[PDB]
From a paper:
Tripartite motif (TRIM) family proteins are RING-type E3 ligases that play key regulatory roles in innate immune signalling pathways that lead to the induction of a type I interferon (IFN) response and production of inflammatory cytokines through activation of the IRF3 and NF-κB transcription factors. Activation of RIG-I initiates a signalling cascade that depends on the E3 ligase activity of [name] and induces the production of IFNs and inflammatory cytokines. An example is non-structural protein 1 ([name]) of influenza A viruses (IAV), a multifunctional virulence factor that binds many host proteins during infection, including TRIM2527–29. To understand [name]-mediated inhibition of [name] activity on a molecular level we have determined crystal structures of the CC domain of [name] in complex with [name]-FL and the isolated ED, and of a [name] CC-[name] fragment, which includes the RIG-I-recognition domain of [name].
Numbering used by the authors: 432 to 629
Write the structure that this text describes.
């Protein structure tokens, strides 16, 4: 019964317009203590890019040591939330969510490559959705912006491509077991991920 009701709510959210999604807006700020040495933060901690000069980070237990990732400041276990990320030179980069308990060290700390995270990703300019180290290739888009709809109350996440209107990239139904952080990956030179304020 819950699964049948969840499905009807999911269809409603898949059909929402951008103004309707923006009603769930949440302000995401990047967490300085999580950024890998190769990740530079700028514009009042709303932009992540690949560092071209030393960032002079101190080692921190919450800092990613293996891959070029960074988290948002806050995590969410209740409510329904929406944020957007503008991309430049998106040859190798990723946008997703993860449990706080995701490992921050070693190969398994990569977004979508473990059971604690979900993401969409550009990889040699080709798009895929990832969870639990299982890939789903997706059609290309000319959009330069991703919208993430995180629904903790009903249990799903949706990734939208945002241009003049919104288009589905991929979704996951999940009965989440703990709070979720926005999460980001920037790997190719010149790649930038900018959190939007519309």
């Amino acid at each position: 019964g819950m699964a049948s009701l969840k499905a009807k709510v999911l269809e409603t959210f898949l059909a929402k317009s951008r103004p309707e999604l923006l009603e769930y807006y949440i302000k995401v700020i990047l967490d300085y203590n999580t950024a890998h040495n190769k990740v530079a933060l700028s514009e009042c901690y709303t932009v992540a890019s690949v560092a071209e000069m030393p960032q002079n980070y101190r080692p921190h237990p919450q800092r990613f040591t293996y891959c070029s990732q960074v988290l948002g400041l806050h995590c969410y276990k209740k409510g329904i939330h929406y944020w957007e990320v503008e991309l430049q030179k998106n040859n190798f980069c990723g946008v997703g969510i993860c449990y706080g308990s995701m490992n921050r060290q070693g190969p398994e700390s990569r977004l979508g490559r473990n059971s604690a995270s979900w993401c969409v990703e550009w990889f040699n300019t080709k798009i895929s959705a990832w969870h639990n180290n299982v890939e789903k290739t997706l059609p290309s888009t000319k959009a330069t912006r991703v919208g993430v709809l995180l629904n903790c109350d009903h249990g799903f996440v949706i990734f939208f491509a945002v241009a003049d209107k919104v288009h589905l990239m991929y979704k996951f139904r999940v009965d989440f077991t703990e709070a979720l952080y926005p999460a980001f990956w920037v790997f190719s030179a010149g790649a930038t991920l900018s959190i939007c304020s519309p």
